[PDB]
Amino acid sequence: HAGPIA
Amino acid sequence: VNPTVFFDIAVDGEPLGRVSFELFADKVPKTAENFRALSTGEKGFGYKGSCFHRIIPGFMCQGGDFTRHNGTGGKSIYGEKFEDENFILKHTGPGILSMANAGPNTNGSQFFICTAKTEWLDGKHVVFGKVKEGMNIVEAMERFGSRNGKTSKKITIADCGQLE
């Protein structure tokens, strides 16, 4: 579920 | 004194170029060390062979998922995940290497290379490094990641390691 949004 | 590691990028098996990074150990050690330690693959697991499952043009390139390769897995050298060492360094522009977490204190092995200035991630993601050489290599990886992020072609970390 790891990750950055725009 | 600051560690230099690198990624040999391949687009569908065919090599593209090398991209080196500078790990800011002088500010964020545990985060810095974990990426160096995982870039060399000294524990028995790491970046060699893993791909960039998520590339969003003008934003960033996300990889580091050597277990589930779909943005779910990957782990640190400290076991599962780890704490948010600090938030001193900011996403000042393209080349910035930062940790791709799932909320606070959830740093594992996933990271992203910024392909533009992303200040809205400041305070939410631990910046720990920056592309030293080969920023034109990440620029090319670009056309191979869609709006939603799904790559058109498989961008893979053919070879990686520590140079200094």
Side-chain angles (χ1 to χ4, degrees):
Chain A
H1 54 355
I5 52 173
Chain B
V1 285
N2 264 350
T4 301
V5 298
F6 70 87
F7 286 168
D8 270 309
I9 306 304
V11 181
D12 280 13
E14 187 171 65
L16 175 71
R18 181 181 295 199
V19 53
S20 64
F21 309 96
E22 185 192 332
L23 318 185
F24 312 140
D26 63 356
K27 303 293 180 58
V28 225
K30 191 178 207 46
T31 328
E33 177 66 12
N34 182 61
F35 192 94
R36 182 205 72 60
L38 283 188
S39 288
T40 72
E42 44 193 58
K43 300 317 215 294
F45 40 98
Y47 310 117
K48 173 137 189 199
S50 79
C51 64
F52 283 75
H53 66 270
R54 194 174 172 244
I55 304 171
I56 302 186
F59 181 32
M60 54 93 246
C61 300
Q62 187 174 343
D65 191 352
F66 55 85
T67 63
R68 278 134 280 227
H69 302 89
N70 57 40
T72 296
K75 45 176 277 193
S76 59
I77 73 183
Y78 319 118
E80 257 195 337
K81 64 190 180 68
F82 76 106
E83 83 296 323
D84 281 329
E85 188 150 34
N86 67 86
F87 288 122
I88 280 154
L89 305 173
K90 329 312 290 177
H91 307 75
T92 54
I96 292 297
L97 178 62
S98 186
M99 285 305 276
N101 63 57
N105 311 305
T106 67
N107 292 296
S109 70
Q110 291 185 42
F111 61 83
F112 59 105
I113 303 168
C114 291
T115 68
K117 170 164 182 286
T118 69
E119 67 306 313
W120 62 94
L121 305 179
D122 287 352
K124 299 168 183 175
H125 292 271
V126 317
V127 176
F128 65 110
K130 182 182 46 47
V131 169
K132 303 175 72 77
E133 309 261 316
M135 188 62 221
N136 63 341
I137 294 319
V138 188
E139 285 206 87
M141 287 164 60
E142 287 300 74
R143 288 137 271 192
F144 310 86
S146 66
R147 245 306 77 68
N148 61 99
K150 73 104 56 259
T151 68
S152 355
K153 296 182 193 166
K154 193 182 176 168
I155 309 308
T156 290
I157 297 176
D159 219 343
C160 50
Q162 174 170 34
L163 287 176
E164 200 204 348

